[PDB]
């Protein structure tokens, strides 16, 4: 349902996820903050199951954002993995991994884990 | 394999996992650094499948360490989840979660995730 996924989404933290679902299974877009200034926007790319099951299952998908744009660089990247669930209260339920570039001594603590729920209306 | 689990184990980072497997599925022990000084020793408690399949499958288990002893307190706790695999080269394969006590604002970044492999001989 690229017609379901394409559009603007918001998570519980106020961040805005703007995405377009290609018919080929590609995800393209931008990830930004509430203010929505050019300095807080970052490119995102991902993939999604363009032919989900018709048994009531969700649509699996994932995307990545490297935290570097033309103004800031946090030397880290986050990946969200989850599924899109359409209907009256459409949403994307995800769990994410935020890996930061670290030295060998600190690699043990390079990755954070969390979860985000995205909806079509601000929370 | 209560006999299999009970004993001293070492992970890739050098830490020492000293555990005893009770007959009713209890795991009790201490977690310390390679040096073994008292100030780096922490209590651990967990559970394990006391009646695993005897067809070559691993023994599921998990344990928790709250990073506070009589000498220090890092306001955090780690849980290891995984399975014990017996044999010539016994090993305990795990994935772990480290949560730090945070304010409501920093909660999104409270949890780190990683993996440890424990063996009977120092790495």
């Amino acid at each position: 349902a690229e017609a379901g996924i394409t559009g603007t989404w918001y998570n519980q933290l106020g961040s805005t996820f703007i995405v377009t679902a290609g018919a080929d299974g590609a995800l393209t877009g931008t990830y930004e903050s509430a203010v929505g200034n050019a300095e807080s926007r970052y490119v995102l790319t991902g993939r999604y199951d363009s032919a989900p099951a018709t048994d009531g299952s969700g649509t699996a998908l994932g995307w990545t954002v490297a935290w570097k744009n033309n103004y800031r660089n946090a030397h880290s990247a986050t990946t969200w993995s989850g599924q899109y669930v359409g209907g009256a209260e459409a949403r994307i339920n995800t769990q994410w991994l935020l890996t930061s570039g670290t030295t060998e001594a600190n690699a043990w603590k390079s990755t954070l884990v969390g979860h985000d729920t995205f909806t079509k209306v601000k929370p | 394999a209560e006999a299999g689990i009970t004993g001293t184990w070492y992970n890739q980072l050098g830490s020492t996992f000293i555990v005893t497997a009770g007959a009713d599925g209890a795991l009790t022990g201490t977690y310390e650094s390679a040096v073994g000084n008292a100030e780096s020793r922490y209590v651990l408690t967990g559970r394990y499948d006391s009646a695993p399949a005897t067809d070559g499958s691993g023994t599921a288990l998990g344990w928790t360490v709250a990073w506070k002893n009589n000498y220090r307190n890092a306001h955090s706790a780690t849980t290891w989840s995984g399975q014990y695999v017996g044999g010539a080269e016994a090993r305990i394969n795990t994935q772990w979660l480290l949560t730090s006590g945070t304010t409501e604002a920093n909660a999104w970044k409270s949890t780190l995730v990683g993996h440890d492999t424990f063996t009977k001989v120092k790495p």
């Binding site: 933290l13 509430a34 807080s40 935290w67 946090a74 935020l98 | 999104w108």
Partner: peptide
């Protein structure tokens, strides 16, 4: 918040 993921639109 000092990381872009939590909406960091300030200067730390």
């Amino acid at each position: 918040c000092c990381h872009p993921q939590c909406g960091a639109a300030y200067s730390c």
